[PDB]
Write a protein that binds this ligand. Structure first.
Ligand SMILES: NCc1ccc(C(F)(F)F)cc1
Ligand SMILES: NCc1ccc(C(F)(F)F)cc1
Length: 330
């Protein structure tokens, strides 16, 4: 079997992407944030503290004839940005673009942090990292991908994120019409539960390519590109007037500047991020200082190839017994 679903940016800056997902019987359609950096499928629900819901569509298990409460199971998650949520667990039927999984663990939020309440466009998250990171206790639960793997034509899913435009998540097949040239595959380490890989270097604009190993994770759930301080300093040094701002919390640049592209290495291949992808607009309404899409990972502890990098490529998440990541230009 296969599945295919359109994913859409939630705002004019591509801060995140939402994908419709059908849950329950009859279907309840929620718009979820597909997150290859986490492994929990959790949703706003009828059980969520009422004051913590502000426009989101909620899952109501009491209206699904296939929902079953998973007795005694709870979940609690904290994300690298300080957001958090928690609740109890149902099993139900979950479908993504024609691809159906029965008995998927659907984690019902009882409490959500403020950053989720204020995001009216995101009804929950669909985790696509490895199931070892799932937070359900006392019995760990599998991700949607792990549950679907056996019935997929190929144990893969692909991310084709758009720049200020819709894109596609495909499950079980690789669309050879969606990219140019060849796909370059690279090894993945699952030891931390992430889609962790090693980039072979970088270049700034038309500058010379620097061969150097950058270990990081492919994370559709993170907006920006977080790289080591040496790399990030080399990039912003090429933008007149750019500086690191402690009060803002990252590199900013004059909104009148033109940004250079950023190239990152995948084996012997190169993925080029256009400079426009790195502009995230004024730091406040009406400001002439703009926020940069490439930031330092120093305070994080790990390098993150987020949406800024991934949307410049066609990305294959190969969940075979030896997992790999594939990158192609598009
Ligand atoms: N998108 C999920 C996510 C968020 C943060 C991190 C961090 F901070 F631990 F790297 C990993 C995964
Ligand atoms: N990396 C997972 C994640 C995704 C979205 C959010 C937001 F946007 F709701 F804050 C937080 C954390």
């Amino acid at each position: 079997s296969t599945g295919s679903a359109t994913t859409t940016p939630i705002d004019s800056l591509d801060d995140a992407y939402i994908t419709p997902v059908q849950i329950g019987t009859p279907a309840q359609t929620l718009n979820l944030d597909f997150d290859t950096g986490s492994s929990d499928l959790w949703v706003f629900s009828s059980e969520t503290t009422a004051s913590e819901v502000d426009g989101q569509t909620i899952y109501t298990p009491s209206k699904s004839t296939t929902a079953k409460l998973l007795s005694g199971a709870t979940w609690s998650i904290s994300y690298g940005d300080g957001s958090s949520s928690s609740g109890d667990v149902y099993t139900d039927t979950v479908s993504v673009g024609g691809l159906t999984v029965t008995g998927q663990a659907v984690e019902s939020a009882k409490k959500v942090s403020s950053s989720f309440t204020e995001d009216s466009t995101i009804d929950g998250l669909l985790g696509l990292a490895f199931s070892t990171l799932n937070t359900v206790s006392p019995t760990q639960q599998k991700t949607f991908f792990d549950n679907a793997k056996a019935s997929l034509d190929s144990p893969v899913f692909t991310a084709d994120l758009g720049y200020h435009a819709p894109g596609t998540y495909n499950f079980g097949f690789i669309d050879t019409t969606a990219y140019t040239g060849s796909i370059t595959y690279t090894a993945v380490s699952t030891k931390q539960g992430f889609w962790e890989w090693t980039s072979t270097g970088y270049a700034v604009g038309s500058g010379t390519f620097k061969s150097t190993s950058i270990d990081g994770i492919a994370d559709t759930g993170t907006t920006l590109l977080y790289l080591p301080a040496t790399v990030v300093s080399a990039y912003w040094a090429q933008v007149s007037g750019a500086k690191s701002s402690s009060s803002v919390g990252g590199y900013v640049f004059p909104c009148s500047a033109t940004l250079p592209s950023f190239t990152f290495g995948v084996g012997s291949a190169r993925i080029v991020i256009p400079g426009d992808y790195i502009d995230f607009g004024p730091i406040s309404t009406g400001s002439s200082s703009c926020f940069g899409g490439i930031q330092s990972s120093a305070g994080i502890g790990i390098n993150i190839f987020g949406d800024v990098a991934l949307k410049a490529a066609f990305v294959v998440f190969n969940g075979a017994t030896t997992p790999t990541l594939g990158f192609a230009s598009k």
